[PDB]
C-alpha cells in the first residue's frame, strides 16, 4: 500500500540541469532512508545516490559524483535529485526507493518500496 511517485524527468540537452522528486504515500515513525536508482536497456539498474532517514548521511555513484545533489524534506519520507551538467550516459529510467537501513540502500534489493520510474534523457 506503501506508493511512491517521481516527478520531474524530462528529455533535455547536454550540459543542463533537471530536479527529480519523489514523494511516499505517508510519513513513517522514522523517517526511511531514500535512494535513486537508474536502468538504462543493456545494463543492471544501478544505484545512483541515497539518504539515510535524518538527511545526515548521503552518498553518490562513482560516476554522477559531484554533478547530482540528493536531498529530503526533514521528517517526510521525499526525496530529491539535482542533476547538473547532464551527459548522454545519464540517459535512463530513473527509480526512487525507500529502505528502512540506511546502508542496504544502495543494493538492487535492499529497498522495501520502488517507485514506477522517470524517464531522464539527454542528447547531445
Known amino acids: 500500500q506503501v506508493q511512491l511517485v517521481e516527478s520531474g524527468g524530462g528529455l533535455v540537452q547536454a550540459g543542463g540541469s533537471l530536479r527529480l522528486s519523489c514523494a511516499a504515500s505517508r510519513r513513517s515513525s522514522r523517517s526511511w532512508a531514500m535512494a535513486w536508482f537508474r536502468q538504462a536497456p543493456g545494463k543492471e539498474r544501478e544505484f545512483v545516490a541515497k539518504?539515510?532517514?535524518?538527511?545526515?548521511?548521503?552518498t553518490y555513484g562513482d560516476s554522477v559524483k559531484g554533478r547530482f545533489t540528493i536531498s529530503r524534506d526533514k521528517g517526510k519520507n521525499t526525496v530529491y535529485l539535482q542533476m547538473d551538467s547532464l551527459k548522454p550516459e545519464d540517459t535512463a529510467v530513473y527509480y526512487c526507493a525507500a529502505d528502512d537501513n540506511y546502508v542496504t540502500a544502495s543494493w538492487r534489493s535492499g529497498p522495501d518500496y520502488w517507485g514506477q520510474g522517470t524517464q531522464v534523457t539527454v542528447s547531445s
Open positions: 539518504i539515510s532517514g535524518d538527511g545526515r548521511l548521503t
